Amino acid sequence: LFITNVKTILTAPGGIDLVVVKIETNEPGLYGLGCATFTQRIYAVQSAIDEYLAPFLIGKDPARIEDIWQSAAVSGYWRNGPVMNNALSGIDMALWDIKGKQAGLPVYELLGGKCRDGIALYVHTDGADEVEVEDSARAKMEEGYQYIRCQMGMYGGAGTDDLRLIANRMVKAKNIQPKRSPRTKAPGIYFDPEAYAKSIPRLFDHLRNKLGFSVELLHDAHERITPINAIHMAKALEPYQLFFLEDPVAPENTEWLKMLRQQSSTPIAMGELFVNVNEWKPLIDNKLIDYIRCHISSIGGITPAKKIAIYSELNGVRTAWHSPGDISPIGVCANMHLDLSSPNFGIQEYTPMNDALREVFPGCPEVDQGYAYVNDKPGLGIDINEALAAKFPCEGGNPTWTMARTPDGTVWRP
Amino acid sequence: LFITNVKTILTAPGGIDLVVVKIETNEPGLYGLGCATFTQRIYAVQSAIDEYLAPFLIGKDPARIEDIWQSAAVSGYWRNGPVMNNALSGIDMALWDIKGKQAGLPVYELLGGKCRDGIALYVHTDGADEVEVEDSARAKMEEGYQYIRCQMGMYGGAGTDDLRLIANRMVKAKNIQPKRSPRTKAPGIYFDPEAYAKSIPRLFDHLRNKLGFSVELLHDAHERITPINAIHMAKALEPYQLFFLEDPVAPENTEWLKMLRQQSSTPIAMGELFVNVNEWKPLIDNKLIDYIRCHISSIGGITPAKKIAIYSELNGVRTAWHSPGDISPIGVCANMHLDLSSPNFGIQEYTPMNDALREVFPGCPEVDQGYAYVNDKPGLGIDINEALAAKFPCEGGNPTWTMARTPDGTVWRP
Amino acid sequence: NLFITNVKTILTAPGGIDLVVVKIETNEPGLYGLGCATFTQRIYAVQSAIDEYLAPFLIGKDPARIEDIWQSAAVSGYWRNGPVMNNALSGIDMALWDIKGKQAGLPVYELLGGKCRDGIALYVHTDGADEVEVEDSARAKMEEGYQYIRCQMGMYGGAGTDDLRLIANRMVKAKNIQPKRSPRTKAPGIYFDPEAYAKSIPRLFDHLRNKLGFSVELLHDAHERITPINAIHMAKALEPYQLFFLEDPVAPENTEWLKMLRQQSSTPIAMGELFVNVNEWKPLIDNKLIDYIRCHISSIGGITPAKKIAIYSELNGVRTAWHSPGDISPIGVCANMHLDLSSPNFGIQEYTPMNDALREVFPGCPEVDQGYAYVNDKPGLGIDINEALAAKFPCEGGNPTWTMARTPDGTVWRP
Amino acid sequence: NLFITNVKTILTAPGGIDLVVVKIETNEPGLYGLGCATFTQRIYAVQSAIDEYLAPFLIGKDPARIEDIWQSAAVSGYWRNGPVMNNALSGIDMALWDIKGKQAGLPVYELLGGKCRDGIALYVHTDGADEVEVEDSARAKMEEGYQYIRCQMGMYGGAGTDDLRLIANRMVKAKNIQPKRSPRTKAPGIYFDPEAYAKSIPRLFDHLRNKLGFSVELLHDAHERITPINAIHMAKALEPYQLFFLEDPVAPENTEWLKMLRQQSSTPIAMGELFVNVNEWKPLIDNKLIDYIRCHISSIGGITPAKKIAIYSELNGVRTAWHSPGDISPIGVCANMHLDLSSPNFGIQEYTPMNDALREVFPGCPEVDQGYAYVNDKPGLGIDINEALAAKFPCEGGNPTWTMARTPDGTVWRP
C-alpha cells in the first residue's frame, strides 16, 4: 500500500473559503480526507501542499503516520507557522482517515474509544445592547444549547470606519461611550478597547439576572485590550461565573498570564492563534489556562492535537478546539473524534452548517438539543463530493476585519 | 560635514527654567536643537555641556548618532545620572534634528513613520475638595480633553509649613483630617500621607458619580506614601477603573512592585525620576508596570528613549513620557515624534503653553480638542529665536517644594 | 505624497540557490524599493503569500508608514508568526526601508543610528573530511585575512551533503566517523550518528588549537543534531578550546533545556537561525541563555523587527550574529550589514562568497577585503536588481533531500 | 457489538521468574486479548486485585472503550496509584489494546502512529567480579552485535545475588570491593558497602574505556544504593567516560535531590522503574531532571498511560527506556516494543534473553539479531499464550531475599 496522488480542493459551500486535502492510494476506492483550512491564506496553503508535501508523499506507505508527520514537519527546515502547519494538517488528517478505513474503525476508536455519548456544544450569540444579547441567548437556549458565547457590539465600536454614530447611540442609552478620534484618521474598522472593557461586566450582570445561573456563559476578549485591563476584566467577571473568558491576551503577551493567574479565579481559555510549542507548553505547564483552544489544523493535525490534549490532561487542563465557520466539515469531525476519545474534553464550539455543506461533505455530525452525535463510519466518517464542491468556488481576497484600529488610529492585534 | 560649535541657551518663556542645546555645522544654515531641561539643576547641566560635551564634539561628523551617544555616555567614566543624562540628551536630540534636516524628513519619519494621526493628551486638574476637582475636570472635558489627571489638595496638606488650618477645614467639612505636629518643627512644606491615602478612593467615587465612566481619569501618588499603603490605594481604586495610578513607589522602592502586582489590577505608571537601566529594565521585564514614564532628557535623549519604547513594546508595556511644564518645546516635540512612531504609545501628558513659548520656539505642535498635531517640517520641526529667548532669563534658585515633611517633621521623597 | 503602485516577486537563482526578492514601485519615476523574502525551501508558498495577499494589500498606500504597514500586514491574515508569513512580510518591510533611504538620500544604516564601526567583521566556513583537511582549510582562510572561522568536519552531524540546495556544492562526509550499525532494513534518508559526531568534536578542536593557536577565533555549529544533555556535555568539553561560539546546541522546540546548560558551561552560545516567534527568542535573551542571536532576519519579518531584536539583545548584553549563508539574497546580505553597522552590540557577520553572477544580477553587493565587509554609501540598501539578468537564472524548486536526516536506527531527527 | 465475557489471571514461570498474565475473552469466538500484570514480588495480591475486582467489573462491557475503562477501573476502588493496583489495571489495559488491534486487523504499533524505525535498539547486561571479567563480558556482547551495554561489577551495590527471583541466576559479588567492618553482631540481610561501591565505579569505567574504546555505548545502574550527594559526585566523576546513562541515582522518595544533581553534572540520567504515581515522574520530566524515563509500564497501569508518559516526555525532550529485565512477561516485552516502534522519542530498550520455554509458552516473541529486536506484524500485540504449557511452569511465590539490603552497620537500605 502506497500513496498515488495528493490534491487540494478549494471550496466554500458555507460561504467561507475551505482547503481540503485528498490522498489517493493504490487500493481502489481507499483514500483519505483532511482539513487544511487557514481561510485567510488558502492560496499559500495550497502551494505548500501541491508544490511540496504532495510530491514528498508519492510512493510512501501511508501507515507510518508519525514518521510522515515528523519528516514532513522538518522537510523545509523552517517550521512552526500557520501556512506550514495547515499544509501538514491536511496530510495528517487524511492519513488518519486512511488508517481508520484500513482498520474498519472510526478514528475515535483508534484514539482510545468513546469517553462520552454526545459532544456538548457552545454557540455564538450577539446583539447591539444587553437586551438584544439576552434575547439571542434565550433563543439558543430554547433550541437546547446549554453553553452560550455572548458578545455585545463589536469591541466598543460598530464594525465600521467611524465611532461617532455608535457613540451617539450610547449617549442616548446612557451607556459608556467610545472616544472621539483625531480630525483625520487612517482607514480601518474602528473600535474602543476602553468602552468595551468597562461595559462587559454589566452585560453579564444583566444576563445572569435574566437567564439565571444554570446556563453556562462564555465570552471572547479576542486579544482586544491591554493585558492589565484583561486582568481587571477577568476579576470583574468573577461574580458571574463564566464557563470561560477567552483570549484575554495575544500570543505575543502570554507572559502576562502569570500575573493574571495570581489574581483571578475566572476560568481562562487561550490558543486559537497558536502555532508553536513555545506558545502553548509554558501555559499548560504552569496552569495558566483551563482550556486549550487550538485550531487543530494550525498546529498540524490530529497527531499533534492528540499530544496537546494529553499534555493538557496530565496538567488538569481541558480541550476546547477552535471551530467556528472557517474550518471544513472534515476538521469539525477531527475535532469531535478527539473530543470523544479525550478524558479531558472541555467543550466544542459549533457553527451551524447549511444544506450546501451537508451535501458537499456527506457524513456531517448530527446535532440534537445542544449535543453533536458523530457517525460510526470508518476513518473520519466524512466524504466530499468533488463535483458539487466545484460549484462553490472560493472568493479569496484580503479580509477587512483584520485592520482593527483604536480611536486614535492605532493598528491593534485583531 | 562636521560640528563647528555647540552652545547652551538658558531661557524661561513659560515661567519655568529651560536648557536648550544648539549644534552648528559647517553647512550654512544647518543646525540642530535639543532639550537638556533638568530645571532644578540648569547650571550643573550647562557646565556638563559647555565644559565637556561641547569640546568633545567639535570637528566630529554628526551623522554617527549612536557612536556619539555611546562614546559621550562613557566619556566621564561615571555615568547614569540626571546631570550627565540631560547633557547627553541635549546633544542627542540636536543630532537627530540634524539627521532629519539632512534627510528632508521629520524625525518621526526616520523612527518608523506615523502609527496614528493625532496624539492623545492628558491634562492636569485639581482643587481643594471633590467638588472643586469635579468642576476643574468638567472644564477640561468641555475643552475636548478625554484623559484627565485629578489631584486634590497637596497630599493631605495645604502646600504650606503648617497643617492646622487645613485640618480645621477638614473638621468643618466632616472629612478625614491630617495629624497634629510636634510642638516645634523644622521648616518645610508639610503634608500628611495617611490623610491623603485614606481620602483618595472617595475622591474617585465622587468623580465617577458625577463625570461618568466614559472619560479616562489618572492619579499621581508621586512617591508620597509607604509602599504597603500604595498597594492598598491601588486596590481601593480598582472599582473606579483609572487609566493609571502613577508613581506608587520611589525608584529606591521598586522592589515593592512585585508585591503590588500580585494583588492589584489598577494600571500602574512609573518612571519620571528614572536615570538608570537597573531601575526601568526589571520593571518592564517582569510586567510590573503598564506605562513607562521617563522624562526622556533624564534618560539621555531620543536614542535611549526609542530603545526603552521598544523594550516596553516587546513586553506589552506602553509609553507615557513625562511632559509637564519643565520640558522645553524641543523636548515636547521629541516626545511626540516618538509617540507618533511607536506602536505602543500610551498617552501624552501636556501642559498648555503660553504665547511666549510659542514665539520663542516657532513650530510648537497644534492642540485641537484633546489631540496634538505636530508639523511636518524636517528634523524636530522646531526652532528657537535666540534674541527673544534672551528676553526671558532664568530665575534659578533652590525650589521650596522639594523639602516635603510629614506631620512629625520627617523629610520624605517629594 | 508617494504611494505604492505595484508590488512584485522575483524568483531567481544566480548563486545556484533559489532566492525570493520583492520589488515595490511608487508613483515617482525611478524610485522603488527592494527586499528579501528568501525562505529557499518554500519559494512558491512565499510567492503566493506576497502576490495574492500582501501585494494587493499595499497598493495605494503611503510607503512612509513603515511601522503601521508592518503591524497591519503582520496581522492581516489573523494567524501569523511563521516562516512563510514572516518572509513575505520581510520582503515588503525591507523594500519600504529601501524606499525611505532613497527618499532621504541616505543609506538605511544612516537612518538606524549611523556607523558604529568602519568595517563589518566576517566569519567564514571551513570543512573537511578529517582534522587535517579542516586544519588546512582554516589555515588558508587565516592566510586570506579572516579572523573568525567556523570549523565543521563533515558539515552537520558529520554527514556532509549531496544536496546542492544547501551550499550549492556537494560536501564530503567525515571519513573517520564510525557510526553505529543500522537495523537490517531501513528507511530512505541521509544517515548520521549523533553519538559519533558529538565525540568527534572536542578532538577536532584540540587538534585545531594545537596546530593553529589561540589567536584566531573558532566557531562550531551543532545544528540541533544531538540530544540536549549531550549538547551540555559538548559545551563543557569545548571550554578548554575557547570557541567564539557554539551554535544551535538545541532545536527551538528544546529551548527550555538552555537553563540547565547555562548553569554548567561557560562556552559562548549562539541560537536562532530557525526562530519565527517572539516566544522563542525573548525568554532566551531575557534570561541570558545565549550570547549571540542568530535570526535569519527575513524569517522574523524584516528590518523593522530585526532592529527591535537587536535592541532587546543590546539591553541584555547579548550581541548580534545574523544568519547569512547561501540562502539569502544580496538584498538580505545588505540589510544584515546595515543593521550590523548601526548596532552597538554587533557580534559577527557570517559570510559566504557571492559569485560573479550574483554580483551582476544584484549591482551594489558589499566589497570584502581582508576579513571585513565594506558596504557602499548609496541611498537605501545600496543594492539593485537587473530583472533581465535575473530571468536568466530560473529557480530549481523542489523538496530538499538533506532535511530527511535519520539516526542509525532510522529515526527522523530535526535536521 | 463485542462485549467482555470472561477475565482471568494466569500465573506462570517459564523463564524461572514468576509472571502474571491476564486473558480477556469476548463473545466473538477466538477473539481474546492478553496483557501483562507482572509485579513479580506480589503475584498473589495482583491476582486478587484482578480476579476479585477488575474481572467482575468488566463483564458485559464493550472492550472498545479503552480509555473509559482505564479511567473508571483506575478509580473503582477509590484509592489508587500503587504497584498492586496499577499492575492489575495494566493486565486489563494491555489486553484491551490487544483486542483493539485484532478487531482492526493491525498491530498495536500501527494504531499508535505506525513505525518510526525498522528495528528496536537493545542494551544488555554485563557483570563480573572484577574489571577484567566485566571487560571480557562486554567484549563478548560487542562481538555478538550489541551496541549498548550496561556494566555492573557485582550487580547492585557490588553485592551480586543469591536470590533466583531477580535474574533466575546467582550472580557473584564484586571480589575486590573492601567493605567496612560490621559491629560485633548484626541482623540477617544481604550486606553491601555503599562507599566502597561508589568509589569502585569511576575506576571500572576508566578501565572499560581504556580497553573497549569510546564507540560502544556503556550504561550503569546505581539502583538507589548510595546517598544523594554521593550520587551527584558519582555522576560528575563519570563525565569523562561519557555514559549513555547513569540509572536510578536516587530513590523515588529522594527525587527532590535531582534539582541539585542537574545544576552540576552533564552525565545523562535515567529514572523510574519504581514509579507508580504521576507526582513522581511528572516534575522530573517538566524540569528536565532526567534524560530517560524508565517506567515498568505495568507498574504505571499499561499501554494507555505509557503512551501518555511517552508523549509528555517527547514534548520535554526526554526519551523512553522502558524497564524490561526478567520480571516482565513476553506480553509486556511486546507492549514495550510496540510503544518503542511508534514513539519519535524512543531512547533504548533493555533486553534480557527469553529462553526456549518462554518462547514456547508465548508464541510470537520478538526476534533478536545483531543488537536489534524485530517484532512480528501480526494483529494486536502479536503474542499468544499456550495455557496448557503455561500450567507446566507453576510459580515459586515467596518473599525475595535480595530486598533485605543492609549497610555495614546493619541499616536497612532501599534496595
Ligand SMILES: O=C(O)[C@H](O)[C@@H](O)[C@H](O)[C@H](O)CO
Ligand atoms: O472564537 C472564535 O470562534 C474566533 O475568535 C473566531 O471568531 C475568529 O475570529 C475566526 O475564526 C478567525 O478566522
Ligand SMILES: O=C(O)[C@H](O)[C@@H](O)[C@H](O)[C@H](O)CO
Ligand atoms: O507627573 C508629573 O508631571 C510630575 O510628577 C511633575 O508634577 C513633577 O513633580 C515635576 O515635573 C518635577 O519637576
Ligand SMILES: O=C(O)[C@H](O)[C@@H](O)[C@H](O)[C@H](O)CO
Ligand atoms: O549556520 C548556517 O549558516 C546554517 O546553519 C545554514 O547552514 C542552514 O543550514 C541553511 O541556511 C538552511 O537553509
Ligand SMILES: O=C(O)[C@H](O)[C@@H](O)[C@H](O)[C@H](O)CO
Ligand atoms: O534495571 C533493571 O533491570 C532493574 O533495576 C531490575 O534489575 C530490577 O532490580 C528488577 O526488575 C526488580 O524486580
Ligand SMILES: [Cl-]
Ligand atoms: Cl507559516
Ligand SMILES: [Cl-]
Ligand atoms: Cl498498591
Ligand SMILES: [Mg+2]
Ligand atoms: Mg476566539
Ligand SMILES: [Mg+2]
Ligand atoms: Mg508624576
Ligand SMILES: [Mg+2]
Ligand atoms: Mg547554523
Ligand SMILES: [Mg+2]
Ligand atoms: Mg534498574
